[PDB]
């Protein structure tokens, strides 16, 4: 009962990646365990829209911690952002332009992701099989925002592979810097992940770190698991994933959180 907040990633965790759906008992559940006082918080990789699409039936109940931890929202109002310091997201821009021209670069604020090319298959992916809202536009470094959160370059093959020689040393001291394959580096602020974004809400509501359960299944879900009173890591993690999470549970296809989260009532 020491428990007064439940944080958990989605992807891997709750649902095959990318699913639009969820059994409905974990509606039920969590509802339960929010009217019992303790506070849900969903904590991914995802936007904003798909989180709160997820969660439809409970969306209003719920705190929102979006795109890796770069924005920490309720319902209906951003509480926080960590965005990016122009110089630091354009300079990006300049020099992907300038020194990696073989490659292409996104910019995205919380509600869409800008592109300088509308026509090449992989905007075509983003776009039109990933869901994602894009807007093309002729010069990122023209635009007027305060809201950028990410800046990701791209290539087929070896991106980076062309970012490792200046690009990565350039900026890994003044961004968070992180390959995804073979084929995209996605840069945020500095300090940027979910730790902090967590760290965020627990301090709002005057709790502490060992009143709060995490779930997850992702190296990078490892420093929540760690200091997180209590933590569970889905079985078919890998072995540094279970070793931060103080127990497992079982897989998202046995519904092994919904089982933990069930134990709690």
Same mark, same amino acid.
């Given at each position: ?121 992989? +905007?075509? $992916? *983003?776009? #039109? ?9 002729? =010069? @990122?470094?023209? &635009? ?60 709002? +509501?005057? $709790? *502490?770190? #060992? ?9 990078? =879900? @490892?420093?929540? &698991? ?40």
């Amino acid at each position: 009962g020491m428990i007064k907040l439940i944080a958990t990633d989605i992807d891997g965790t709750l649902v095959k990646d990318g699913s639009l759906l969820i059994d409905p008992e974990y509606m039920s559940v969590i509802d339960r365990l929010i009217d019992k006082g303790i506070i849900f918080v969903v904590c991914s990789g995802r936007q904003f829209s798909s989180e709160f699409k997820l969660f439809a039936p409970i969306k209003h109940k719920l705190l929102y911690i979006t795109d890796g931890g770069t924005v920490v929202r309720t319902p209906k109002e951003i509480l926080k952002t960590y965005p990016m310091d122009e110089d630091i997201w354009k300079g990006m821009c300049r020099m992907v332009r300038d020194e990696l021209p073989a490659c292409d670069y996104f910019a995205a604020t919380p509600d869409f992701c800008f592109a300088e090319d509308g026509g090449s298959p992989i +905007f075509h $992916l *983003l776009r #039109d099989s990933y869901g994602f809202e894009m807007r093309e536009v002729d =010069d @990122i470094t023209r &635009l007027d925002r305060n809201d950028i959160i990410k800046f990701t370059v791209f290539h087929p093959d070896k991106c980076e592979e062309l970012c490792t020689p200046v690009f990565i040393p350039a900026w890994n001291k003044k961004a968070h810097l992180a390959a995804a394959g073979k084929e995209w580096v996605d840069c945020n602020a500095k300090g940027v992940s979910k730790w902090t974004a967590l760290s965020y809400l627990i301090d709002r +509501f005057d $709790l *502490l770190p #060992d009143e709060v359960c995490c779930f997850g299944d992702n190296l990078n =879900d @490892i420093e929540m &698991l760690q200091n997180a009173g209590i933590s569970y890591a889905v079985s078919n993690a890998r072995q540094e994933v279970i070793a931060a999470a103080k127990h497992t549970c079982a897989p998202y296809w046995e519904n092994g959180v919904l089982s933990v989260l069930k134990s709690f009532l």
